[PDB]
Amino acid sequence: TLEDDLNETNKYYLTNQIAVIHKKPTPVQIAYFKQSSTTDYNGIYKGRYIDFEAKETKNKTSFPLQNFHDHQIEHMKQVKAQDGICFVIISAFDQVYFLEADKLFYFWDRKEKNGRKSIRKDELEETAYPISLGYAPRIDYISIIEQLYF
Amino acid sequence: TLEDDLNETNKYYLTNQIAVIHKKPTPVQEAYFKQSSTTDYNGIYKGRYIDFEAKETKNKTSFPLQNFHDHQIEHMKQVKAQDGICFVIISAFDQVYFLEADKLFYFWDRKEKNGRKSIRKDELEETAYPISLGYAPRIDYISIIEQLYF
């Protein structure tokens, strides 16, 4: 489960003073569950604002785009206009991928022209970066941020 | 009320692409409230991570430091050590002040040590910057972040 794995990654980065990244809790209107209008994960690494969402699927062929909603994407685009580090982490096809926000916007924006509602495996492998899994941290997405931004 | 005003302030910054800052949802447990281990505001302005807490008081002489809590202060230490912009917004004595995180560590680290588990009107008036109240941003804390850091 991606969410547990990111909890333990995030604790590991905090505890070792590498980064300070938290998952925002589910909103509750006071009671009922609401739909957040942002991504769930944000925080700081080396001065910079880091913002992402994280989704997994068991589909063997493609990642359904509806795992995300428009408010997430719109927030991500607002983050990008402020020069934030913003992306998604996708667990699919026995791997875990870091997909830059620009690339996710490409897939999101074309989903209405021809019914392309999923990112195919080959489409994801071409556009996204495999993240190295280990024991600790579990999902080392900060090393991708280091490679691409520092 | 500080919380509605910061909401409108943050929507205004968002709408005009000045910054992307949100209050995080309060964590909950069938109906129970839980203590958050971070501050309630964070986001991005001009590439940088922004993080803050905001509190009000009636009281006319002094600001009770137990308006904050240990976990919040430790989070802020972490944030500042990560070279983020961190601070608090205090609504008191019919004014609104931006108090840099360093200054508030001062008062907090001298909290258990000997006695002084308040910031006295005059104490705040010397350490923290008055915030311009307005129609537009209701609470123009970014102006002050912009002076101090840019």
Swiss-Prot record, chain A:
What cellular-component terms does GO give this entry? cytoplasm
Q: Where is this site: Transition state stabilizer?
A: K55
* GO BP annotation list: chromosome segregation; DNA recombination; DNA repair
- Name the enzyme's class: hydrolase
Residues bound to Mg(2+) are T38, D40, E53, Q72
Question: What is this enzyme's EC?
Answer: 3.1.21.10
Entry's family note: Belongs to the RecU family.
Q: What's the stated role of this polypeptide? A: Has at least 2 separable functions; Holliday junction resolution with generation of monomeric chromosomes, and negative modulation of RecA activity. Endonuclease that resolves Holliday junction intermediates in genetic recombination. Cleaves mobile four-strand junctions by introducing symmetrical nicks in paired strands. Promotes annealing of linear ssDNA with homologous dsDNA. Required for DNA repair, homologous recombination and chromosome segregation. Partially inhibits the hydrolysis of dATP or rATP by RecA. Holliday junction resolution is stimulated by RuvB.
Name of the protein in its database record: Holliday junction resolvase RecU
What organism, scientifically named, is this protein from?
A: Bacillus subtilis (strain 168)
Within the intact protein, the region shown is 34 to 198 of 206
Curated annotation (Swiss-Prot), chain B:
* Consequences of knocking out this gene: Cells lacking this gene have greatly increased sensitivity to DNA damaging agents. 25-fold decreased plasmid transformation and only slightly reduced chromosomal DNA transformation. A single recU deletion has a 12-fold decreased transformation efficiency with chromosomal DNA; a double mutS2-recU deletion strain has a 57-fold decrease in chromosomal DNA transformation. A single recU deletion rapidly increases RecA expression after DNA damage. Forms anucleate cells 100-times more frequently than wild-type cells during normal growth.
Q: What is its EC number?
A: 3.1.21.10
Q: Where is this site: Transition state stabilizer?
A: K55
Report the top EC class in one word: hydrolase
Query: Where the protein is mainly located, per its record?
Result: cytoplasm
- Catalytic activities: Endonucleolytic cleavage at a junction such as a reciprocal single-stranded crossover between two homologous DNA duplexes (Holliday junction)
- Cofactor detail note: Binds 1 Mg(2+) ion per subunit.
What happens on changing D51A? Reduces Holliday junction resolution activity 6-fold
Relate the assembly described in the record.
Homodimer. Interacts with RuvB.
**What's the name of the protein?**
Holliday junction resolvase RecU
